Amino acid sequence: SLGTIIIVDDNKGVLTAVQLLLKNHFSKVITLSSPVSLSTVLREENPEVVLLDMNFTSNEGLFWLHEIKRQYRDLPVVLFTAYADIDLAVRGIKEGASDFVVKPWDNQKLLETLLNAASQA
Structure with missing residues (x-):
């Protein structure tokens, strides 16, 4: 089955659009623009994938990719x-x-x- 996806983006309109697009595929779509919120949801929500804004907090996307992978080595991150x-x-x-x-x-x-x-092995 497909569980939770987290979308991380500075642009609230992108969050609105992607939520609408993904709502009916994933069990839960979490959208956020806050580093603090991101830390909570990664811990508590057992995400299956994170969609990460290249310019998040514009240190940008690459920094956040690294920090997520540091703690959650097997969590797929799509830029x-x-x-x-x-x-x-x-x-x-x-x-x-x-x-x-x-x-x-x-x-x-x-x-x-x-x-x-x-859906990777």
Whole structure:
């Protein structure tokens, strides 16, 4: 089955859109823009995947990828990247991100990337 996904983004509209897109696939969709909130939900909510804004808190996405992986080594993290940041998304993959999705996104590709990230052996 598919449990919880956490979406981390500075842009409340992106959170609104992604929640709407993913609401009916995952059991729970948690959206947030706070580092403090992120720490609580990672501990308590047994997430299956995190979708992480490349520019979160713009130290940005790569910093947060690292900190999440430090504590939750097996939690897939997918970076959500503007085209202007694709070099940093590629560096993210090198540094252990599970995948990335570029913005503006394709709705079906976004879902598929997240399901696949949450469905690795």
